[PDB]
Design a protein around this ligand. Structure first.
Ligand code: NA
Length: 311
């Protein structure tokens, strides 16, 4: 209904709801773009500033930085993954019946890769352009569209460290560290349902939430670092600030120090809040289901709010 925010190179904050919104860092609206009946994906931003969203009307929209339509790609099947931008401006997303599409930056289809079952989480891209996504297996696809390897359900998105290690959280509570050649490096068992994608923070620590309200911090050697208990569910991914603070949403926006203690928490309404986005200056942006975009100072005070047109 309302996407999380994505931050452009000039600090512009984009999010999707009834429209795609471009918000200047002072909280003033730069432009809004009508992408069909409704926007359904978190906007993805190319290195040249193109903004990509999927619409309820069945199209992938490419939007220029000035808020004008660049092109549309009609998706055959219902798209279940948000667009992901490859290393050379290729756009990847997945369909409900297991098709991974690669779209050239000019709106033409590059290739499609069929898997057995639905692709409901986003892909992640390695340094050499490899495309990793989960499903029944974890798949690694070469940029040319041929399969590299697969690794033995997951409803989350792979996180990739600087050395190429791939981290995946499975629904039954494993965190797998996978080597780039597709062999298991280690697994860590939580025995808890996990519906949140991992994120790699300070000194390659891996963080993820459990449904029952624990934020886990795992060292890159496969050993537990700490937990942090909320008394609400965690079903979304966390984000790391430049000073290592870990930000996630539950009943509130939490800010957690790298040592596992709470720094602050911010109340952003009665609705579910989305994954926090962090700008270079430390500002934290969160959206709520009812079309509010919050800008939060790193000390936890509200900078400004923005409200959508239809909400
Ligand atoms: Na703790």
């Amino acid at each position: 209904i309302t996407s999380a925010a994505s931050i452009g190179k000039d600090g512009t904050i984009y999010f999707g709801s009834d429209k795609v919104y471009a918000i200047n860092p002072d909280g003033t609206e730069k432009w809004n773009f009508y992408a069909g009946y409704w926007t359904v994906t978190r906007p993805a931003i190319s290195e040249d500033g193109t903004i990509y969203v999927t619409s309820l009307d069945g199209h992938l929209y490419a939007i220029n930085p000035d808020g004008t339509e660049k092109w549309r790609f009609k998706t055959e099947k219902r798209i279940e993954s948000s667009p992901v931008i490859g290393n050379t401006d290729t756009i990847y997303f997945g369909s409900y019946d297991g098709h991974l599409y690669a779209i050239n930056p000019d709106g033409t289809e590059k290739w499609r890769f069929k898997t057995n079952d639905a692709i409901t989480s986003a892909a992640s891209i390695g340094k050499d352009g490899t495309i990793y996504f989960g499903s029944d297996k974890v798949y690694a696809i070469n940029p040319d569209g041929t399969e590299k390897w697969n690794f033995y359900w997951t409803v989350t998105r792979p996180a990739i460290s600087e050395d190429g290690t791939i981290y995946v959280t499975s629904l039954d509570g494993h965190l797998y560290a996978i080597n780039p050649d597709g062999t298991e490096k280690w697994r860590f068992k939580t025995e808890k349902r996990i519906e949140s994608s991992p994120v790699i923070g300070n000194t390659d620590t891996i963080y993820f939430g459990s449904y029952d309200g624990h934020l886990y911090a795992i060292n890159p050697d496969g050993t537990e670092k700490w937990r942090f208990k909320t008394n609400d569910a965690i079903t979304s991914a966390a984000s790391i600030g430049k000073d290592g603070t870990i930000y996630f949403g539950s009943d509130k926006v939490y800010a957690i120090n790298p040592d596992g203690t709470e720094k602050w928490n911010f109340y952003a309404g009665y609705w579910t809040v989305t994954r926090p986005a962090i700008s270079e200056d430390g500002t934290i942006y969160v959206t709520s289901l009812d079309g509010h975009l919050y800008a939060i100072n790193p000390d936890g005070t509200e900078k400004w709010r923005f409200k959508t047109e239809k909400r």
